[PDB]
């Protein structure tokens, strides 16, 4: 729901305006002027294909962080760059063990916030405690305050 914004950060803006016009025809004949089910449907139809309104409304909700339920034009551009091949490859358990022995400098089987903090400060990017905090919390689904190893798989599942 955000990685698409991260990818357009990597992509250009000419694609954004091409999708502006896209959205415009994606609602050519719309009921709501945004992409509901049938709007995305006529998108696929102009694409030469015929979709079902369920997955339509779902890709509508596949970005839905707040529960917005619809395709805002912003959320629209999100959904349209969702389909460009920008960042792939779904990082997971093996290299995550290789990296978790490090990320668990405490070797708990669980990344305490100590290691995550230090390695973020090492990341070179600006390090907020919103960073380290959200990262601890998303890792730690048991919410132990420490990112378990499989909670670390969660922590680095796919994030290219």
């Amino acid at each position: 729901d955000d990685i698409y914004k991260a990818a357009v950060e990597q992509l250009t803006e000419e694609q954004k305006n091409e999708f502006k016009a896209a959205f415009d025809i994606f609602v050519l004949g719309a009921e709501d002027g945004c992409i509901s089910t049938k709007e995305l449907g006529k998108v696929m139809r102009m694409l030469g294909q015929n979709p079902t309104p369920e997955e339509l409304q779902e890709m509508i909700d596949e970005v839905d962080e707040d529960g917005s339920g619809t395709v805002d034009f912003d959320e629209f551009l999100v959904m349209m760059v969702r389909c460009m091949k920008d960042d792939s490859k779904g990082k997971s358990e093996e290299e995550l063990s290789d990296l978790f022995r490090m990320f668990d400098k405490n070797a708990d089987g669980y990344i305490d916030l100590d290691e995550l903090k230090i390695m973020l400060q090492a990341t070179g990017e600006t390090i907020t405690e919103d960073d380290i905090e959200e990262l601890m919390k998303d890792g730690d689904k048991n919410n132990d305050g420490r990112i378990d190893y499989d909670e670390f798989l969660e922590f680095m599942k796919g994030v290219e």
Binding site: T12, E14, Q15, E18, A22, M46, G48
Partner: peptide, 12 residues
């Protein structure tokens, strides 16, 4: 976007 735009899908 190519099946949509043809020539106009240049970056698309």
């Amino acid at each position: 976007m190519q099946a949509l735009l043809g020539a106009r899908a240049k970056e698309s």
